[PDB]
Paper text:
By using the actin cytoskeleton as tracks, myosin also powers cellular cargo transport processes and can serve as a molecular anchor and force sensor. The myosin motor domain consists of four subdomains: the actin-binding upper and lower 50 kDa (U50 and L50) domains, which are separated by the central actin-binding cleft, the N-terminal domain, and the converter domain, containing the long α-helical extension known as the lever arm. The active site of myosin is located at the interface of the U50 domain and the N-terminal domain and is allosterically coupled to both the actin-binding interface and the lever arm.
To reveal the structural mechanism by which myosin-V senses the nucleotide state of F-actin, we have solved the structure of myosin-V in the rigor state in complex with young JASP-stabilized F-actin (F-actin-JASP) to 3.2 Å (referred to as young actomyosin-V). By applying a mask including only the central three actin and two myosin molecules (central 3er/2er), the refinement was subsequently focused on the central section of the filament (central 3er/2er maps, resolutions stated). The atomic model of myosin in this structure superimposes perfectly with the one bound to aged F-actin-PHD, indicating that the nucleotide state of F-actin has no structural effect on myosin-V in the rigor state. Surprisingly, and despite having ADP-Pi bound to its active site, F-actin adopts the closed D-loop state, which is characteristic for aged ADP-bound F-actin. However, a control structure of F-actin-JASP alone (3.1 Å) confirms that actin was successfully stabilized in the desired young state, having a characteristic open D-loop conformation and ADP-Pi bound to its active site. Thus, we conclude that binding of myosin-V to young F-actin-JASP induces structural changes that ultimately result in the closed D-loop conformation, thereby abolishing the effect of JASP. Conversely, it has a remarkable effect on the structure of young F-actin-JASP, specifically selecting the closed D-loop state and thereby overriding the ‘rejuvenating effect’ of JASP.
Numbering used by the authors:
A (entry chain A): 433 to 504
B (entry chain A): 649 to 792
C (entry chain A): 5 to 33, 36 to 54, 57 to 186, 190 to 216
D (entry chain B): 4 to 79, 86 to 97, 100 to 150
Write the structure that this text describes.
């Protein structure tokens, strides 16, 4: 069982390569969190006989692709 | 890769005041920390969906103040399906689960407000009736 | 519509990020007659378009879970956290599956041993929120199924992430039946602080 | 109102006249309306009075002739029963809950009025037969 101490999203009057890397890491963690919450809620909706196609999923992949993809 | 192997559980930490005071809550600093922890955006994402869930008996208990005795029925689940389907017009707002009702944001506040209005007006009517009846008796006492 | 006399709304204020108001006359489709606590009366512009955040009823206010609130917005969250923290001294709160932990600088009793045995066994909703409830939800999922479990903690380093981890590990140690992981890890903490921590404009250490 | 009713009401009015000048206060207008068989809300009383200010409500005096049109305007069961079943539908009402709601919601009354009307009507559990209590307060 593994307990992660990390830093959160960070903004200053001046932002710099350090803040840019911290924010890209936080964007990745937030993507994992959003996918996990969306999975758990899909399982709860299928459990409760609701149409699961209703639940709306919100995806920061366009930002991650902006930062990290080729010609990012 | 290390996290994807594993099922997560989350904690967020927020720093309530800038100066280490024991319980002072500074709403500016706490707002900044709640944005920096993505809690506010998580709450935005949730508010789009069905955030609020009620078990049919607990709903039935709370809104028996609204419910009429003719509506009460031998199946509470069907009773609440009927009463709710009347009370909130647009079915898009809500869904019926097996054991829980789901509501979009605000709908439980809507039910609570119509409950407070109805209960207030009924209380006004009974209160004015009792005040009149007692003071009318004091009128008859002064006549006697 | 939902706007009536004897209804409450949140108004923006630069000194405290939101201020409570009461509506003195019912709205009908460009200005509202707004009561306050800061004087009795005020006249408040609507903006070209916007209506203020409408305030949740007080059965839902102060609930152990922010998603019990019927309106969800920054004012309701900020108020509900403030009332739990200031009035009841309940530092822990829930939002979806997240546990929000608000750091008191004052020390509390609540970490004491017995509560570990009180939380243990209890399903996550059956008890009021506390860090032991997440520590159990991990330990229980580890015992129930093959998978490892992870706990992920975020915030400016003063906020007390290390204290949360320390108490999670005390929960594990006390339920599991021990030796001397905890003392060694907390002995390591000054080294990893000394070689990995830094001083930043917004924050020391 | 017929001549006889107006005469009986004027006599009653003078019985409620505690100063001898043949007049009542604005604040007494509601008292006279309820004493004469009307059951107006506080809002209706203030509306027919013209939303008077505190000072004139407590010290400005009006004779019967100006009060009368207001009494007329005020003058011109199943809902009451359902309203009572709201606060229960087994024909009972908690005494504690009815007391709390009557002293804390709506047009709040004093505890003494509620004690006076409720005296002898609650049992050991603190339950009121509300159909009988309703007939009693409407009689």
């Amino acid at each position: 069982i593994g307990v992660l101490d990390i830093y959160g999203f960070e903004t200053f009057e001046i932002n710099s390569f350090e803040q840019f890397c911290i924010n890209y890491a936080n964007e990745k963690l937030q993507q994992q969190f959003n996918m996990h919450v969306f999975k758990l809620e899909q399982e709860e909706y299928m459990k409760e006989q609701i149409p699961w196609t209703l639940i709306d999923f919100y995806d920061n992949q366009p930002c991650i692709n902006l930062i990290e993809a080729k010609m990012g | 890769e290390t996290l994807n192997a594993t099922t997560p559980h989350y904690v967020r930490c927020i720093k309530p005041n800038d100066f280490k005071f024991p319980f002072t809550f500074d709403e500016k600093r706490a707002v900044q920390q709640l944005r920096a922890c993505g809690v506010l955006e998580t709450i935005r994402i949730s508010a789009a969906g069905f955030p609020s869930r009620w078990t049919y008996q607990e709903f039935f208990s709370r809104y028996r103040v609204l419910m009429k005795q003719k509506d009460v029925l031998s199946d509470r689940k069907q009773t609440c399906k009927n009463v709710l389907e009347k009370l909130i017009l647009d079915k898009d707002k809500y869904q019926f689960g097996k054991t829980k009702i789901f509501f979009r944001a605000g709908q439980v506040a809507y039910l609570e407000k119509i409950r407070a209005d109805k209960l207030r007006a009924a209380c006004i009517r009974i209160q004015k009736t009792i005040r009149g009846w007692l003071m009318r008796k004091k009128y008859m006492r002064m006549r006697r | 519509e939902l706007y009536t006399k004897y209804a409450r709304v949140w108004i923006p204020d630069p000194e405290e990020v939101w201020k409570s108001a009461e509506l003195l006359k019912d709205y009908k489709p460009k200005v509202l007659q707004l009561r306050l606590e800061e004087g009795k009366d005020l006249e408040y512009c609507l903006d070209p378009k916007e209506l203020p955040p409408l305030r949740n009823p007080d059965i839902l206010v102060g609930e152990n879970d922010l998603t019990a609130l019927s309106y969800l917005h920054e004012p309701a969250v900020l108020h509900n956290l403030k009332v739990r923290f200031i009035d009841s001294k309940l530092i822990y709160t829930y939002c979806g599956i997240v546990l929000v932990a608000i750091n008191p600088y004052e020390q509390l009793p609540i970490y004491g041993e017995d509560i570990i045995n009180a939380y243990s066994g209890q399903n996550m909703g059956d008890m009021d929120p506390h860090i032991f409830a997440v520590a159990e939800e991990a330990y229980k999922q580890m015992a129930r199924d093959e998978r490892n479990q992870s706990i992920i903690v975020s915030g400016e380093s003063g906020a007390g992430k290390t204290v949360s981890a320390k108490y999670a590990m005390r929960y594990f140690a006390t339920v599991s039946g021990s030796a001397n992981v905890e003392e060694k890890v907390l002995a390591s903490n000054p080294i990893m602080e000394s070689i990995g921590n830094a001083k930043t404009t917004r924050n020391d250490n | 109102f017929n001549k006889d009713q107006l005469e009986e009401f004027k006599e009653a009015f003078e019985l409620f006249d505690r100063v001898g000048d043949g007049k009542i206060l604005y604040s007494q207008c509601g008292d006279v309306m309820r004493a004469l068989g009307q059951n107006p809300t506080n809002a209706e009383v203030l509306k027919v009075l013209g939303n008077p200010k505190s000072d004139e409500l407590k010290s400005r005096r009006v004779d019967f002739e100006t009060f009368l049109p207001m009494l007329q305007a005020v003058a011109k069961y199943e809902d009451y029963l359902e309203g009572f079943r709201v606060f229960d539908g087994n024909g009972k009402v908690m005494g504690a809950e009815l007391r709390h709601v009557l002293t804390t919601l709506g047009e709040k009354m004093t505890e003494e009025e509620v004690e006076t009307v409720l005296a002898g009507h609650e049992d050991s559990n603190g339950c009121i037969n509300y159909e009988a209590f309703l007939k009693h307060i409407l009689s």
